[PDB]
Amino acid sequence: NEGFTVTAEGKGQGTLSVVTMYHAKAKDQLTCNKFDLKVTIKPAPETEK
């Protein structure tokens, strides 16, 4: 990403367009979007014992 100079000379007309594409830091985006997933592991008390 750097600046530059455009110099145009002569009869006529045209269109200039400049687009930058890059990696932008995430906007606190959670990869677990749309899902509230909860996992719990616990030893069994005495219900089996």
PDB file of N, CA and C in Angstrom:
ATOM      1  N   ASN A   1       0.846  -1.188   0.000  1.00  0.00           N
ATOM      2  CA  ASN A   1       0.000   0.000   0.000  1.00  0.00           C
ATOM      3  C   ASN A   1       0.883   1.240   0.000  1.00  0.00           C
ATOM      4  N   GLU A   2       0.909   1.963  -1.117  1.00  0.00           N
ATOM      5  CA  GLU A   2       1.690   3.190  -1.195  1.00  0.00           C
ATOM      6  C   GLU A   2       1.016   4.158  -2.153  1.00  0.00           C
ATOM      7  N   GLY A   3       1.337   5.440  -1.977  1.00  0.00           N
ATOM      8  CA  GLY A   3       0.805   6.475  -2.833  1.00  0.00           C
ATOM      9  C   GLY A   3       1.606   6.667  -4.092  1.00  0.00           C
ATOM     10  N   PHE A   4       1.001   7.390  -5.027  1.00  0.00           N
ATOM     11  CA  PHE A   4       1.586   7.607  -6.341  1.00  0.00           C
ATOM     12  C   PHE A   4       0.939   8.842  -6.954  1.00  0.00           C
ATOM     13  N   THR A   5       1.430   9.217  -8.129  1.00  0.00           N
ATOM     14  CA  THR A   5       0.999  10.412  -8.834  1.00  0.00           C
ATOM     15  C   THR A   5       0.470  10.007 -10.202  1.00  0.00           C
ATOM     16  N   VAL A   6      -0.662  10.585 -10.596  1.00  0.00           N
ATOM     17  CA  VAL A   6      -1.246  10.376 -11.914  1.00  0.00           C
ATOM     18  C   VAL A   6      -1.067  11.663 -12.701  1.00  0.00           C
ATOM     19  N   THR A   7      -0.551  11.544 -13.918  1.00  0.00           N
ATOM     20  CA  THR A   7      -0.383  12.680 -14.814  1.00  0.00           C
ATOM     21  C   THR A   7      -1.055  12.325 -16.127  1.00  0.00           C
ATOM     22  N   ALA A   8      -2.047  13.116 -16.522  1.00  0.00           N
ATOM     23  CA  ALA A   8      -2.799  12.876 -17.742  1.00  0.00           C
ATOM     24  C   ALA A   8      -2.707  14.099 -18.640  1.00  0.00           C
ATOM     25  N   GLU A   9      -2.518  13.853 -19.934  1.00  0.00           N
ATOM     26  CA  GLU A   9      -2.379  14.918 -20.914  1.00  0.00           C
ATOM     27  C   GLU A   9      -3.103  14.521 -22.192  1.00  0.00           C
ATOM     28  N   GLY A  10      -3.849  15.458 -22.759  1.00  0.00           N
ATOM     29  CA  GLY A  10      -4.442  15.291 -24.070  1.00  0.00           C
ATOM     30  C   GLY A  10      -5.957  15.375 -24.035  1.00  0.00           C
ATOM     31  N   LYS A  11      -6.526  15.378 -25.238  1.00  0.00           N
ATOM     32  CA  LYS A  11      -7.974  15.385 -25.388  1.00  0.00           C
ATOM     33  C   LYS A  11      -8.556  14.021 -25.035  1.00  0.00           C
ATOM     34  N   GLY A  12      -9.785  14.033 -24.537  1.00  0.00           N
ATOM     35  CA  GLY A  12     -10.483  12.826 -24.149  1.00  0.00           C
ATOM     36  C   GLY A  12     -10.908  12.851 -22.694  1.00  0.00           C
ATOM     37  N   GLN A  13     -11.481  11.724 -22.266  1.00  0.00           N
ATOM     38  CA  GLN A  13     -12.006  11.595 -20.915  1.00  0.00           C
ATOM     39  C   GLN A  13     -12.000  10.119 -20.537  1.00  0.00           C
ATOM     40  N   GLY A  14     -11.716   9.834 -19.267  1.00  0.00           N
ATOM     41  CA  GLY A  14     -11.701   8.464 -18.791  1.00  0.00           C
ATOM     42  C   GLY A  14     -12.044   8.334 -17.320  1.00  0.00           C
ATOM     43  N   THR A  15     -11.891   7.129 -16.769  1.00  0.00           N
ATOM     44  CA  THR A  15     -12.221   6.847 -15.377  1.00  0.00           C
ATOM     45  C   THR A  15     -11.061   6.112 -14.715  1.00  0.00           C
ATOM     46  N   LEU A  16     -10.626   6.617 -13.561  1.00  0.00           N
ATOM     47  CA  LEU A  16      -9.633   5.976 -12.711  1.00  0.00           C
ATOM     48  C   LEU A  16     -10.330   5.364 -11.503  1.00  0.00           C
ATOM     49  N   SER A  17      -9.935   4.145 -11.141  1.00  0.00           N
ATOM     50  CA  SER A  17     -10.461   3.493  -9.947  1.00  0.00           C
ATOM     51  C   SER A  17      -9.346   2.731  -9.247  1.00  0.00           C
ATOM     52  N   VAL A  18      -9.272   2.886  -7.925  1.00  0.00           N
ATOM     53  CA  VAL A  18      -8.221   2.295  -7.103  1.00  0.00           C
ATOM     54  C   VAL A  18      -8.888   1.525  -5.967  1.00  0.00           C
ATOM     55  N   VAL A  19      -8.570   0.233  -5.857  1.00  0.00           N
ATOM     56  CA  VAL A  19      -9.143  -0.664  -4.856  1.00  0.00           C
ATOM     57  C   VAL A  19      -7.990  -1.360  -4.140  1.00  0.00           C
ATOM     58  N   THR A  20      -8.033  -1.388  -2.808  1.00  0.00           N
ATOM     59  CA  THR A  20      -7.055  -2.113  -2.008  1.00  0.00           C
ATOM     60  C   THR A  20      -7.688  -3.356  -1.395  1.00  0.00           C
ATOM     61  N   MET A  21      -6.950  -4.467  -1.420  1.00  0.00           N
ATOM     62  CA  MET A  21      -7.388  -5.724  -0.825  1.00  0.00           C
ATOM     63  C   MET A  21      -6.322  -6.202   0.149  1.00  0.00           C
ATOM     64  N   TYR A  22      -6.738  -6.551   1.366  1.00  0.00           N
ATOM     65  CA  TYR A  22      -5.785  -6.871   2.425  1.00  0.00           C
ATOM     66  C   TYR A  22      -6.459  -7.728   3.488  1.00  0.00           C
ATOM     67  N   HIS A  23      -5.643  -8.202   4.429  1.00  0.00           N
ATOM     68  CA  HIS A  23      -6.133  -8.878   5.623  1.00  0.00           C
ATOM     69  C   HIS A  23      -6.353  -7.837   6.712  1.00  0.00           C
ATOM     70  N   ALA A  24      -7.597  -7.687   7.144  1.00  0.00           N
ATOM     71  CA  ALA A  24      -7.931  -6.802   8.246  1.00  0.00           C
ATOM     72  C   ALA A  24      -8.193  -7.651   9.476  1.00  0.00           C
ATOM     73  N   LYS A  25      -7.817  -7.126  10.647  1.00  0.00           N
ATOM     74  CA  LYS A  25      -8.023  -7.819  11.916  1.00  0.00           C
ATOM     75  C   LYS A  25      -9.513  -8.009  12.182  1.00  0.00           C
ATOM     76  N   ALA A  26      -9.856  -9.152  12.782  1.00  0.00           N
ATOM     77  CA  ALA A  26     -11.247  -9.542  12.976  1.00  0.00           C
ATOM     78  C   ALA A  26     -11.960  -8.605  13.946  1.00  0.00           C
ATOM     79  N   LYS A  27     -13.263  -8.455  13.735  1.00  0.00           N
ATOM     80  CA  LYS A  27     -14.077  -7.509  14.498  1.00  0.00           C
ATOM     81  C   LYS A  27     -14.791  -8.227  15.638  1.00  0.00           C
ATOM     82  N   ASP A  28     -13.967  -8.889  16.469  1.00  0.00           N
ATOM     83  CA  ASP A  28     -14.388  -9.778  17.562  1.00  0.00           C
ATOM     84  C   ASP A  28     -15.305 -10.893  17.063  1.00  0.00           C
ATOM     85  N   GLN A  29     -15.070 -11.350  15.833  1.00  0.00           N
ATOM     86  CA  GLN A  29     -15.912 -12.366  15.216  1.00  0.00           C
ATOM     87  C   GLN A  29     -15.644 -13.722  15.852  1.00  0.00           C
ATOM     88  N   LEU A  30     -16.693 -14.328  16.393  1.00  0.00           N
ATOM     89  CA  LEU A  30     -16.588 -15.635  17.013  1.00  0.00           C
ATOM     90  C   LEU A  30     -16.836 -16.675  15.931  1.00  0.00           C
ATOM     91  N   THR A  31     -15.933 -17.661  15.844  1.00  0.00           N
ATOM     92  CA  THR A  31     -16.084 -18.755  14.886  1.00  0.00           C
ATOM     93  C   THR A  31     -17.316 -19.603  15.178  1.00  0.00           C
ATOM     94  N   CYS A  32     -17.736 -19.661  16.443  1.00  0.00           N
ATOM     95  CA  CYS A  32     -18.987 -20.285  16.852  1.00  0.00           C
ATOM     96  C   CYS A  32     -20.178 -19.344  16.690  1.00  0.00           C
ATOM     97  N   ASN A  33     -20.299 -18.698  15.532  1.00  0.00           N
ATOM     98  CA  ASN A  33     -21.465 -17.880  15.242  1.00  0.00           C
ATOM     99  C   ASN A  33     -22.683 -18.770  15.042  1.00  0.00           C
ATOM    100  N   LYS A  34     -23.826 -18.295  15.554  1.00  0.00           N
ATOM    101  CA  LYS A  34     -25.177 -18.869  15.517  1.00  0.00           C
ATOM    102  C   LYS A  34     -25.354 -20.113  16.385  1.00  0.00           C
ATOM    103  N   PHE A  35     -24.369 -20.500  17.194  1.00  0.00           N
ATOM    104  CA  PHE A  35     -24.503 -21.698  18.019  1.00  0.00           C
ATOM    105  C   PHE A  35     -23.977 -21.441  19.422  1.00  0.00           C
ATOM    106  N   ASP A  36     -24.794 -21.754  20.429  1.00  0.00           N
ATOM    107  CA  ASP A  36     -24.374 -21.735  21.833  1.00  0.00           C
ATOM    108  C   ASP A  36     -24.076 -23.166  22.262  1.00  0.00           C
ATOM    109  N   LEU A  37     -22.849 -23.618  22.021  1.00  0.00           N
ATOM    110  CA  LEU A  37     -22.461 -25.001  22.274  1.00  0.00           C
ATOM    111  C   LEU A  37     -21.755 -25.118  23.620  1.00  0.00           C
ATOM    112  N   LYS A  38     -22.264 -26.006  24.475  1.00  0.00           N
ATOM    113  CA  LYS A  38     -21.738 -26.218  25.819  1.00  0.00           C
ATOM    114  C   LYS A  38     -21.441 -27.697  26.021  1.00  0.00           C
ATOM    115  N   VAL A  39     -20.252 -28.001  26.547  1.00  0.00           N
ATOM    116  CA  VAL A  39     -19.809 -29.372  26.798  1.00  0.00           C
ATOM    117  C   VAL A  39     -19.351 -29.471  28.250  1.00  0.00           C
ATOM    118  N   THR A  40     -19.840 -30.489  28.962  1.00  0.00           N
ATOM    119  CA  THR A  40     -19.543 -30.702  30.375  1.00  0.00           C
ATOM    120  C   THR A  40     -19.191 -32.164  30.610  1.00  0.00           C
ATOM    121  N   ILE A  41     -18.020 -32.414  31.198  1.00  0.00           N
ATOM    122  CA  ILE A  41     -17.601 -33.755  31.592  1.00  0.00           C
ATOM    123  C   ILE A  41     -17.483 -33.799  33.115  1.00  0.00           C
ATOM    124  N   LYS A  42     -18.110 -34.808  33.729  1.00  0.00           N
ATOM    125  CA  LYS A  42     -18.152 -34.966  35.178  1.00  0.00           C
ATOM    126  C   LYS A  42     -18.102 -36.447  35.523  1.00  0.00           C
ATOM    127  N   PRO A  43     -17.391 -36.823  36.587  1.00  0.00           N
ATOM    128  CA  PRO A  43     -17.471 -38.207  37.067  1.00  0.00           C
ATOM    129  C   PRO A  43     -18.816 -38.467  37.724  1.00  0.00           C
ATOM    130  N   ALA A  44     -19.315 -39.686  37.541  1.00  0.00           N
ATOM    131  CA  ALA A  44     -20.579 -40.070  38.145  1.00  0.00           C
ATOM    132  C   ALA A  44     -20.411 -40.229  39.655  1.00  0.00           C
ATOM    133  N   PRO A  45     -21.378 -39.738  40.461  1.00  0.00           N
ATOM    134  CA  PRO A  45     -21.222 -39.759  41.927  1.00  0.00           C
ATOM    135  C   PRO A  45     -21.280 -41.151  42.545  1.00  0.00           C
ATOM    136  N   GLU A  46     -22.465 -41.584  42.972  1.00  0.00           N
ATOM    137  CA  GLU A  46     -22.662 -42.925  43.501  1.00  0.00           C
ATOM    138  C   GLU A  46     -23.892 -43.595  42.902  1.00  0.00           C
ATOM    139  N   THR A  47     -24.489 -43.005  41.859  1.00  0.00           N
ATOM    140  CA  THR A  47     -25.690 -43.561  41.233  1.00  0.00           C
ATOM    141  C   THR A  47     -25.433 -44.917  40.581  1.00  0.00           C
ATOM    142  N   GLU A  48     -24.234 -45.123  40.044  1.00  0.00           N
ATOM    143  CA  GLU A  48     -23.833 -46.433  39.551  1.00  0.00           C
ATOM    144  C   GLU A  48     -23.209 -47.285  40.650  1.00  0.00           C
ATOM    145  N   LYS A  49     -22.490 -46.658  41.582  1.00  0.00           N
ATOM    146  CA  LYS A  49     -21.715 -47.389  42.578  1.00  0.00           C
ATOM    147  C   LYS A  49     -22.555 -47.936  43.728  1.00  0.00           C
TER     148      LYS A  49
END
